[PDB]
Amino acid sequence: ATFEIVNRCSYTVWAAASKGDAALDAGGRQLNSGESWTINVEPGTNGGKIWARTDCYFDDSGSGICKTGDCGGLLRCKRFGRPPTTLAEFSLNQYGKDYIDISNIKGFNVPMNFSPTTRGCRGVRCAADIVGQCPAKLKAPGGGCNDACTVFQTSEYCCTTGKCGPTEYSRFFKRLCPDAFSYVLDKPTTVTCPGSSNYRVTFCPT
C-alpha cells in the first residue's frame, strides 16, 4: 500500500512510520513545508502508525532528538514516538478490509487529515487548534498537548483495568476533534476501507 505523506504546515516536520517493533518503509524522513514523501507499507500490516515530529536535530548518522514524537533519537523510526503525537493509525488486509483512524490517546502535536486516495470509504481529520486551546495542566513544555495518561499515570486515564470512562480531559480532545479517539474506550471512529486501499496523510490540512 502506498501512503503519500504531505506536510502542508508552515514549519518543517519529520514524518515517522512504524508498527512498534519495526519501521515501516524507511521509518522517517524530513518534510519541509509543502513537501511530499510516499512510502510503501506491506499488505497485512497490523497496528501501524504515522505521525509528525517537531523541532528535531539529527547528526550525520541519523541520531538526535525531537521535541515531539521522538522515537529513541532516530531519524528513521523503528519504534513509536514520545507523546504528545497525533496518530494516524491503520491495520491493513484484516480479513479483506483495511481499518483506519486518528487518535489523540497519546496527545496532540500537529493537525492531520488521514484519507484514502482510492475508492470506497471516507477519511478522518483532527485539524482544530488543540495546542492553542490545550488545558493548562496538559500543555507540554516541550511543545504540544499531552493526553491525561501521560501527565497523570492513573488507571482511569490510562484505562489500565479496561474499565475507564470519559474524563474532563478526554472530553476536551473529543470536543475539538469528534472524529478522533479521545481515550482508550471511546466510541470508535474507526473507518472500514476496502482491503489494499491507498492513503494520504496530510499534516496541517487546513
Coordinates of C-alpha atoms in Angstrom, one line a residue:
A1 CA 0.0 0.0 0.0
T2 CA 1.1 3.5 -0.7
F3 CA 0.8 6.3 1.8
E4 CA 1.6 9.8 0.5
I5 CA 2.7 11.9 3.5
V6 CA 2.3 15.6 2.8
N7 CA 3.4 18.4 5.0
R8 CA 1.1 21.5 4.5
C9 CA 2.3 23.1 7.7
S10 CA 4.3 26.2 7.5
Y11 CA 7.1 24.6 9.6
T12 CA 9.3 21.5 8.9
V13 CA 8.2 18.2 10.3
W14 CA 9.9 14.8 10.5
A15 CA 7.5 12.2 9.5
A16 CA 7.6 8.8 11.1
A17 CA 6.1 5.5 10.4
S18 CA 6.3 2.3 12.5
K19 CA 4.4 -0.7 13.6
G20 CA 6.0 -0.6 17.1
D21 CA 8.7 -3.3 16.7
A22 CA 9.8 -2.3 13.1
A23 CA 10.0 0.7 10.8
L24 CA 7.5 1.0 8.0
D25 CA 9.5 1.7 4.8
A26 CA 12.5 3.9 5.8
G27 CA 10.7 4.8 9.1
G28 CA 11.2 8.5 9.0
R29 CA 12.2 11.5 6.8
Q30 CA 12.3 15.3 7.0
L31 CA 9.5 17.1 5.2
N32 CA 9.9 20.8 4.7
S33 CA 6.8 22.9 4.3
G34 CA 4.9 21.7 1.2
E35 CA 7.0 18.5 0.6
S36 CA 5.5 15.0 -0.1
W37 CA 7.0 11.7 0.8
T38 CA 5.4 8.5 -0.5
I39 CA 6.1 5.3 1.5
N40 CA 5.2 1.7 0.8
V41 CA 3.6 -0.3 3.6
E42 CA 3.4 -4.1 3.4
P43 CA 0.0 -5.6 3.0
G44 CA -1.2 -7.1 6.2
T45 CA 0.5 -4.6 8.4
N46 CA -1.3 -4.6 11.7
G47 CA -1.1 -1.7 14.2
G48 CA 0.8 0.7 12.0
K49 CA 1.1 4.3 12.8
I50 CA 2.2 7.5 11.1
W51 CA 3.0 10.8 13.0
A52 CA 4.8 14.0 12.7
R53 CA 7.7 15.0 14.8
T54 CA 8.6 18.7 15.5
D55 CA 11.8 20.6 16.3
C56 CA 14.3 17.8 15.5
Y57 CA 18.1 17.9 15.3
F58 CA 19.8 14.9 13.7
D59 CA 23.5 14.3 13.1
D60 CA 25.1 12.8 10.0
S61 CA 24.4 9.3 11.3
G62 CA 20.6 10.0 11.7
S63 CA 20.9 10.3 15.6
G64 CA 19.4 13.1 17.6
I65 CA 16.3 14.4 19.3
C66 CA 12.9 15.8 18.6
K67 CA 10.6 17.9 20.9
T68 CA 7.6 15.9 20.0
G69 CA 7.3 12.3 18.8
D70 CA 11.0 11.4 19.3
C71 CA 11.5 7.7 18.5
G72 CA 14.6 6.9 20.6
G73 CA 16.5 9.7 19.0
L74 CA 16.5 8.1 15.5
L75 CA 15.7 9.9 12.1
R76 CA 14.5 6.5 10.9
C77 CA 11.9 5.4 13.4
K78 CA 11.8 1.6 14.3
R79 CA 9.6 2.2 17.4
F80 CA 6.6 4.5 18.3
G81 CA 7.3 8.1 19.3
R82 CA 7.2 10.0 22.5
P83 CA 3.9 11.8 23.3
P84 CA 2.5 14.2 22.5
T85 CA 1.8 12.8 19.0
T86 CA -1.3 13.0 16.9
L87 CA -1.6 9.5 15.4
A88 CA -2.8 8.2 12.1
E89 CA -3.4 4.5 12.9
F90 CA -4.1 1.6 10.5
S91 CA -4.4 -2.1 10.1
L92 CA -4.3 -3.4 6.6
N93 CA -5.8 -6.6 4.9
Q94 CA -7.6 -7.6 8.1
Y95 CA -10.0 -10.3 6.8
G96 CA -10.4 -8.5 3.5
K97 CA -10.6 -4.9 4.8
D98 CA -8.4 -2.0 6.0
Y99 CA -9.2 -0.1 9.2
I100 CA -8.1 3.5 9.7
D101 CA -8.4 6.1 12.4
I102 CA -6.9 9.2 14.0
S103 CA -6.2 9.1 17.8
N104 CA -5.4 11.7 20.4
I105 CA -4.9 9.0 23.1
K106 CA -1.2 9.8 23.1
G107 CA -1.8 13.6 22.9
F108 CA -1.7 16.0 20.0
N109 CA 1.2 17.8 18.4
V110 CA 0.3 18.5 14.7
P111 CA -3.1 18.7 13.0
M112 CA -3.8 16.0 10.4
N113 CA -6.1 14.5 7.8
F114 CA -5.9 10.8 7.1
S115 CA -7.8 10.0 3.9
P116 CA -7.9 7.2 1.3
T117 CA -6.7 8.0 -2.2
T118 CA -8.7 5.1 -3.6
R119 CA -12.4 4.5 -3.7
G120 CA -14.8 3.1 -1.1
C121 CA -14.6 5.0 2.2
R122 CA -14.2 8.4 3.8
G123 CA -11.2 10.0 5.5
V124 CA -10.9 11.2 9.0
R125 CA -9.5 14.5 10.3
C126 CA -8.3 16.2 13.5
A127 CA -7.3 19.8 12.4
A128 CA -8.6 22.0 15.2
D129 CA -6.1 24.1 17.2
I130 CA -5.7 21.7 20.1
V131 CA -2.3 23.0 21.1
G132 CA -3.6 26.6 21.4
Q133 CA -6.7 25.6 23.3
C134 CA -4.9 22.9 25.4
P135 CA -5.9 22.8 29.1
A136 CA -3.0 24.3 31.2
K137 CA -2.4 21.0 33.0
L138 CA -2.0 19.2 29.7
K139 CA 0.3 21.6 28.0
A140 CA 3.7 20.0 27.1
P141 CA 6.6 22.4 28.0
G142 CA 8.4 20.7 25.1
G143 CA 5.6 21.6 22.7
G144 CA 2.1 20.1 22.0
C145 CA -0.9 19.0 24.2
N146 CA -0.3 15.8 26.4
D147 CA -3.0 13.2 27.0
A148 CA -4.0 12.8 30.6
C149 CA -2.5 9.3 30.9
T150 CA 0.9 10.7 30.1
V151 CA 0.6 13.5 32.6
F152 CA -1.1 11.7 35.5
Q153 CA -0.4 7.9 35.2
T154 CA -3.8 6.9 36.7
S155 CA -5.8 3.7 36.0
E156 CA -8.6 5.9 35.0
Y157 CA -6.8 8.0 32.3
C158 CA -4.6 5.1 31.1
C159 CA -7.6 2.6 31.1
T160 CA -5.4 0.1 32.7
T161 CA -8.2 -2.2 34.0
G162 CA -10.1 -1.9 30.8
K163 CA -13.0 -0.2 32.8
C164 CA -12.5 3.5 32.3
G165 CA -14.9 6.3 31.4
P166 CA -14.6 9.6 29.7
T167 CA -13.0 12.4 31.6
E168 CA -12.7 16.2 31.7
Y169 CA -9.5 15.9 29.8
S170 CA -10.7 13.3 27.2
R171 CA -13.8 15.5 26.6
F172 CA -11.5 18.4 25.6
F173 CA -9.8 16.3 22.8
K174 CA -13.2 15.0 21.8
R175 CA -14.8 18.4 21.7
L176 CA -12.2 19.8 19.4
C177 CA -11.9 16.7 17.4
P178 CA -15.0 14.5 17.5
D179 CA -13.7 12.2 14.7
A180 CA -10.6 11.1 16.7
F181 CA -10.1 8.7 19.6
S182 CA -10.0 10.7 22.9
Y183 CA -9.4 7.9 25.4
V184 CA -8.9 4.1 25.1
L185 CA -12.6 3.2 25.4
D186 CA -14.1 6.0 23.3
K187 CA -16.9 5.1 21.0
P188 CA -14.9 4.1 17.9
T189 CA -14.3 6.5 15.0
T190 CA -12.6 3.8 13.0
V191 CA -13.3 3.8 9.2
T192 CA -13.6 0.5 7.2
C193 CA -11.9 0.8 3.8
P194 CA -11.6 -1.8 1.0
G195 CA -8.6 -4.2 1.6
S196 CA -5.4 -2.8 -0.1
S197 CA -6.6 0.8 -0.2
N198 CA -4.0 3.6 -0.6
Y199 CA -3.9 6.7 1.5
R200 CA -2.7 10.2 2.0
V201 CA -1.7 11.6 5.4
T202 CA -1.7 15.4 5.3
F203 CA -0.2 17.5 8.2
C204 CA -1.9 20.9 8.7
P205 CA -4.6 20.2 6.2
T206 CA -6.5 23.5 6.8

